Design a protein around this ligand. Structure first.
Ligand code: K
Ligand code: K
Ligand code: K
Ligand code: K
Ligand code: MG
Ligand code: MG
Ligand code: MG
Ligand code: MG
Ligand code: MG
Ligand code: MG
Ligand code: MG
Ligand code: MG
Ligand code: MG
Ligand code: MG
Ligand code: MG
Ligand code: MG
Ligand code: MG
Ligand code: MG
Ligand code: MG
Ligand code: MG
Ligand code: MG
Ligand code: MG
Ligand code: MG
Ligand code: MG
Ligand code: MG
Ligand code: MG
Ligand code: MG
Ligand code: MG
Ligand code: MG
Ligand code: MG
Ligand code: MG
Ligand code: MG
Ligand code: MG
Ligand code: MG
Ligand code: MG
Ligand code: MG
Ligand code: MG
Ligand code: MG
Lengths: 125, 147, 128, 187, 112
RNA sequence: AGUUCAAGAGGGCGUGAAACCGUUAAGAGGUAAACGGGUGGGGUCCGCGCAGUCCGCCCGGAGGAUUCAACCCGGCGGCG
RNA sequence: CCACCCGACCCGUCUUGAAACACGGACCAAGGAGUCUAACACGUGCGCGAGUCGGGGGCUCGCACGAAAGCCGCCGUGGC
RNA sequence: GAAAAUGGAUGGCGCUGGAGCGUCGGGCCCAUACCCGGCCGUCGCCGGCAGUCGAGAGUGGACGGGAGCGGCGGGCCGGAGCCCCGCGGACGCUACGCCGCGACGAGUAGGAGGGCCGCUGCGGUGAGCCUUGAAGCCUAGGGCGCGGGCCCGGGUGGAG
């Protein structure tokens, strides 16, 4: 289970980074990249992953399926949301809150998409 | 694992836990069991009463095979046979009793600690204790001697 | 302007001078790196007035500002772009430092990527 | 200053298991919460015993738990031991029993189940009896270890039935001066 | 006698000590007496539910003085403003140790 | 002058520490020097500061559009 | 780097007592001292549990790793 | 009364309407002690948080009748939804984590804990770093850490 696997990888993981009195988790589907049971993106049955789209416009929201936990090829569903910021945040907010899919990660996913979109804006010096 | 020893923690402490006054000298007090009847008498008398002296008859060329006599108590006597044998006898219609050969199990003497289940049994042994034979008789069993 | 931290609390240091080893001035063999004096008569160990001060836990810094650079950020050594990505969701409190051994070719890629993600870099102009 | 002594300030008690067992530490997580969020002092004892070392969690034999469960008013209650249940080959009839233990040996497990019993782990016990209601908390014999024979008054003192440390047992081993009046004395 | 200066406090001294510096021993902790609920939850069973009851119980030496007085953490007073006369001798010798009777109130004012 | 990426690798020659010395620059100097704490002065260098809060929402003006809600058709997912 | 005010005796060591007219130490670099084996005790961790343990041997068409690993069960002789 | 060897000691200078001796008053000075407050750590609290539970929710209040009162249906006979103008509402909880409160803090010999202190090599791992410059070394460069130490800039160096 999630609690069992956490006790295995809480301190021994290829994604774990311990440095400068800080701990980071480099695993995918981890919003905040924090080494935390809550934000870990591998041990849970339901995970939310927000990363930039392949091209530098929009975000891709990743949703783990309840079925096929042991089948990594088909376990994740990738959706590309490419529209204005307010509409993009609303779509993610509905994907989390309305589907009751990991509501603990609502603001985490919104802030991550908010930060990714701001990065995709042209940088002015 | 040397990294977990006190030596690593004692680096920079001068006397290494051995004192500034008494120091760590070579053999203060003698080597081995020196002084057992002298300066180390109290230790020897306190933790090893009986250490010094001769007691008893000495026997040359002791062959421990001769005195080999492993023992099994009564309480663990039924473990020597399969559980099938015990239950089949208890529900047996006629008064047929199973034969338990403790010599086959690797025991020579049957001692009498504990109590037996109330069912007849034929116990074969080289030696029987008095209570062991009494308790076998009480449940309706028999003691058979073998060589 | 430079990227700003989420908060900029007043940083209080109980002591700014380093703790020098006893008698490290009188000799070159005695480096300044602190060593606890364990001599039986050592007046520094016995804490006589006007002597070398000995580090103790009472000098510990406020936990709210411990490890915080004077800019208000907290350092995080990075070696590549991928290691820079972990600072995306904490770029208001943690800044990046590029490792001393990263090449000038790779360093330019890290710096510009940190510009896009609004991650402050403490050593941006190095090897340029 | 303050006229106090600080040698007793730190209490030497175990606040976490020394073990790195993840399953045990998950049980401690479960029972830390139960002890905190319930008023059941049964939970506080189980949590405390989950920390304890192996020597402080002696095995409980099948016979002793059967004997302690046959006492009046202990029918249909569940036997809880924070430790191992071992089989006792000196017992013939295993009664139907409901037991909760960290470990149960294979033959003890087989005998309890063939008798119609039900074996629970501590996660299952939390579900059935969250406050430990209807439980018989049992301990194995703590001083059943052979080391306690050597503890106490020194063997060379009067009225001291303490087992000495001897590399061998026999006529030539610590049976002379100080062990009989015919050689010096006897204590 | 050498180590203490004591006397007989009046009503005002009992008031000021418990109001300014009164702390309660609640669950082995030194808690300032900021609310009456702290007193009532500890000394309520004895009929003491407010600072006024506690002052009255202390001042008149009532039937629960021991519980009410043991409830009070020892008063941590300041050094005597204006200085001591002589800590090492008795009050009647011009010093400060011993029983100064009603004059303890003067010392309480300077130390509270 | 030349070779070499390099002699700032020149034949006990990779790197080239400390002790110690020479020179250069700066500072100081009658209680041997050195040291702790506190400030002050100078210098070096850094921020490169040298016009120096941005972020969110709302209001107003001034533009532009792959245009919003709703509804229909596919696909996927969550829950029952 | 320098100035000034207050503080400020040289460390290590043995010692009841060291700044000592007690000893060692001119300076710097590198090397430099509780180890390993057997035994025993207790404490702690893990496995199994009235048992437990193959450590010696053998089997697996030996052999980069692999001199490892796996297995034995009428190999548990034997130790405890 | 009263004499000792270098020149010397109410600590010195000096002090005689006292800066001497005795008895006394007021004020004033400052320790690392005491009080109040900040920060660090230690220790204690059968300490709090799995409720991330923006409808949760949290003394024991409900349900079904019989009988009713208080308000809501006198032209007295009179008993409805939980959600919705808004579809939304920060952080958290590496549970070995986070949070609160209180008291405490000298130390040789010695004991114990922690060390994201440090060195060398091995199994893993970092789709790690590196001839666009590794190790090392130098540095009135910039910083972090109570500290052990560490990071970065510049220089030198040339293969890890
Ligand atoms: K020792
Ligand atoms: K020079
Ligand atoms: K010496
Ligand atoms: K000397
Ligand atoms: Mg010491
Ligand atoms: Mg010595
Ligand atoms: Mg000695
Ligand atoms: Mg510092
Ligand atoms: Mg030095
Ligand atoms: Mg001394
Ligand atoms: Mg200390
Ligand atoms: Mg104190
Ligand atoms: Mg102490
Ligand atoms: Mg005790
Ligand atoms: Mg005053
Ligand atoms: Mg005295
Ligand atoms: Mg070169
Ligand atoms: Mg040339
Ligand atoms: Mg060169
Ligand atoms: Mg060269
Ligand atoms: Mg050379
Ligand atoms: Mg100074
Ligand atoms: Mg002497
Ligand atoms: Mg000395
Ligand atoms: Mg002398
Ligand atoms: Mg000598
Ligand atoms: Mg000499
Ligand atoms: Mg060396
Ligand atoms: Mg053991
Ligand atoms: Mg075996
Ligand atoms: Mg080989
Ligand atoms: Mg083998
Ligand atoms: Mg055997
Ligand atoms: Mg045998
Ligand atoms: Mg003098
Ligand atoms: Mg201390
Ligand atoms: Mg790993
Ligand atoms: Mg910096």
């Amino acid at each position: 289970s999630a609690h069992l696997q956490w006790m295995v990888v809480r301190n021994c993981s290829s994604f774990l980074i311990k440095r400068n009195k800080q701990t980071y988790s480099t695993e995918p589907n981890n919003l905040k990249a924090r080494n935390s049971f809550r934000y870990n993106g591998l041990i849970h049955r339901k995970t939310v992953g927000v990363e930039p789209a392949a091209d530098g416009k929009g975000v891709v929201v990743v949703i783990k399926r309840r079925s096929g936990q042991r089948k990594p090829a088909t376990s994740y569903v990738r959706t590309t949301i490419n529209k204005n910021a307010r509409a993009t945040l609303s779509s993610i907010r509905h994907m989390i809150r309305k589907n009751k899919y990991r509501p603990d990660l609502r603001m985490a996913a919104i802030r991550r998409a908010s930060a990714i979109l701001r990065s995709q804006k042209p940088v002015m010096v | 694992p040397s990294r977990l020893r006190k030596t690593r923690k004692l680096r920079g402490h001068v006397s290494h836990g051995h004192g500034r006054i008494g120091k760590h000298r070579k053999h203060p007090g003698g080597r081995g069991n020196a002084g057992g009847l002298h300066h180390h008498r109290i230790n020897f008398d306190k933790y090893h009463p009986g250490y010094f002296g001769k007691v008893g008859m000495k026997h040359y060329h002791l062959k421990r095979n001769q005195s080999f006599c492993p023992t099994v108590n009564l309480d663990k006597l039924w473990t020597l046979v399969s559980e099938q044998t015990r239950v089949n006898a208890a529900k047996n219609k006629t008064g047929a009793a199973p034969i338990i050969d403790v010599v086959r199990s690797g025991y020579y003497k049957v001692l009498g600690k504990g109590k037996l289940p109330k069912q007849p049994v034929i116990v074969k042994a080289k030696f029987f204790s008095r209570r062991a034979e009494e308790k076998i008789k009480s449940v309706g069993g028999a003691c058979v001697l073998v060589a | 302007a430079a990227l700003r931290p989420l908060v900029k609390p007043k940083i209080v240091k109980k002591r700014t001078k380093k703790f020098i080893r006893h008698q490290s001035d009188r000799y070159v063999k005695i480096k300044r790196n602190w060593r606890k004096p364990r001599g039986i008569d050592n007046r520094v160990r016995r804490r006589f007035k006007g002597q070398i001060l000995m580090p103790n836990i009472g000098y510990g810094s406020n936990k709210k500002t411990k490890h915080m650079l004077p800019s208000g950020f907290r350092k995080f050594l990075v070696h590549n772009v991928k290691e820079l990505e972990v600072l995306l969701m904490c770029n208001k409190s943690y800044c990046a430092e590029i490792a001393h051994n990263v090449s000038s070719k790779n360093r330019k890629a890290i710096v510009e990527r940190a510009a896009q993600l609004a991650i402050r870099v403490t050593n941006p102009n190095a090897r340029l | 200053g303050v006229d106090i002594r600080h040698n007793k300030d730190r209490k030497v008690r175990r606040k976490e298991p020394k073990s790195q067992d993840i399953y045990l530490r998950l049980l401690v997580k479960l029972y830390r919460f139960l002890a905190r969020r319930t008023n059941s002092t049964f939970n506080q004892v189980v949590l405390k015993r989950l920390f304890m070392s192996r020597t402080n969690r002696p095995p409980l034999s099948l016979s002793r738990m059967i004997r302690k469960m046959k006492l009046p008013g202990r029918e249909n209650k569940t036997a809880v031991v924070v430790g191992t249940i071992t089989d006792d080959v000196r017992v013939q009839e295993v009664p139907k029993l409901k037991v909760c233990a960290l470990r149960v040996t294979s033959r003890a497990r087989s005998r309890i189940l063939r008798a119609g019993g039900k074996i629970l782990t501590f996660d299952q016990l939390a579900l059935d009896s969250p406050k430990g209601c209807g439980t018989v908390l049992l301990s194995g014999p703590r001083k059943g270890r052979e080391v306690y024979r050597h503890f106490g008054k020194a063997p060379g003192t009067p009225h001291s039935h303490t087992k000495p440390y001897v590399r061998s047992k026999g006529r030539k081993f610590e049976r002379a001066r100080g062990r009989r009046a015919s050689r010096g004395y006897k204590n | 006698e050498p180590y203490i200066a004591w006397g007989y406090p009046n009503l005002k001294s009992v008031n000021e000590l418990i109001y300014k510096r009164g702390y309660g021993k609640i669950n082995k902790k030194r808690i300032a007496l900021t609310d009456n609920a702290l007193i009532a939850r500890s000394l309520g069973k004895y009929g003491i539910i407010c600072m006024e009851d506690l002052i009255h119980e202390i001042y008149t030496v009532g039937k629960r003085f021991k519980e009410a007085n043991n409830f009070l953490w020892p008063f941590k007073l300041s050094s005597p403003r204006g200085g001591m006369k002589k800590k090492t001798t008795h009050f009647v010798e011009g010093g400060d140790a011993g029983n100064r009777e009603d004059q303890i109130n003067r010392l309480i004012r300077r130390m509270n």
